[PDB]
Amino acid sequence: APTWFYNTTNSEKLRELQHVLGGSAKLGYLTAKVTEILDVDLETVIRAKAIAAYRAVRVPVIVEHGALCIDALNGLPGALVKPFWESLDTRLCEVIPAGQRTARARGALCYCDGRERHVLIEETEGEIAPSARGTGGFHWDPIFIPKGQTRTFAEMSLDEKLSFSPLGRLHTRLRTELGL
């Protein structure tokens, strides 16, 4: 039986974390739906998301929340990235001026055992594409190009995306600190 449970309602995040942390027999999976607080800071939202997901499932839980801070929007959306891609789908490439396309793709894990909340944060420098390209992946992957690379997260496979994305450095930090 598992001792840690990764809670997400997003079935595309589920197949990413099962691609690397899938063979760990100490990790279970839950699908409880939580409501995030209104703040652009990633550290504040992921810390209030774990206390709201432990209250739902009542087991040691691991939650995940991201950020897409943009220099042209002075850090917007930040942790408000979920309603931007709902509203501005590929017009988000158009509302940003050409010449200052730089942005940061941040991502955070927070595990709560019922007594303590520990936040792990990784981060990837990049720049917003001039137009959306690529088919693979999911939300905002056709618009983000990492630094040095020419391609998007959507144009790369799941092994190649996790060699650039924040989750590929968060697998090893979550496995080491939890013994998965």
Partner: protein, 277 residues
Amino acid sequence: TTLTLSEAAPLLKKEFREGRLIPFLGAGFSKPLKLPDGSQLIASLAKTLGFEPELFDMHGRFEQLAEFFAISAPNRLQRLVYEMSLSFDSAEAEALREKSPMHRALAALDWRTIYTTNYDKHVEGALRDAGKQAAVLASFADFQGPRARDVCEVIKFHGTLDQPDTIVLTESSYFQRMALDAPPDQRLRADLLANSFLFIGYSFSDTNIRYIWYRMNQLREQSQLGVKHSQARRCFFATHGAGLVQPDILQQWNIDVIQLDPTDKSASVARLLESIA
């Protein structure tokens, strides 16, 4: 600090073959029958009173919101029992009960006493489905009534829907049971003197259940037994989602926690009841 399923299985076989294991079934045992738990009742009481169900929840505890419901109008509690009877003991809840793996695994064992705190005929009804016969005991007239010789006695600890005077739901009915003078209270305290219990689908939120296990330790500590002998007769608490505080409170009362797999709640309970056989 917590038993697993394979660790607790030889401990439950020993108490069952000696005839000293008694199941205690809660509201989570009728959850696969699509019945309300203690939270969906309050969502239904708030709709009748004109409350939003999230605003009604923050004015008091479960006992106190039902006390407020019962005194809102005359005959308001009688209507609730009628509505609960039509919903809890409906024919589609009967049909989900024969194909339920927990109720089949419960009735496959040859119990002698079963305690429940839920108002539905789905624990004795599970015994009728397996060809066995049961005897519901809820009031004083049931205990003095005629039974057969060797029949599993199902003790409806909080009452039955066909005897609406026995249902304890409001706060005043929980305070009336603090005297421990009701016939289900007197039968429970005498069975607790000699038997191990198995809590399935029940969470210790009732302050009269916790008060009975409190006062069994006042007999246990005053009897001045050793460290070895006062810890010999244990009770078992099967729960998917016990927190961090409640398992250590119950270690005082010789209650061990059996951690079940929370991914599938119904199959984890059914494998526990099949491991006793």
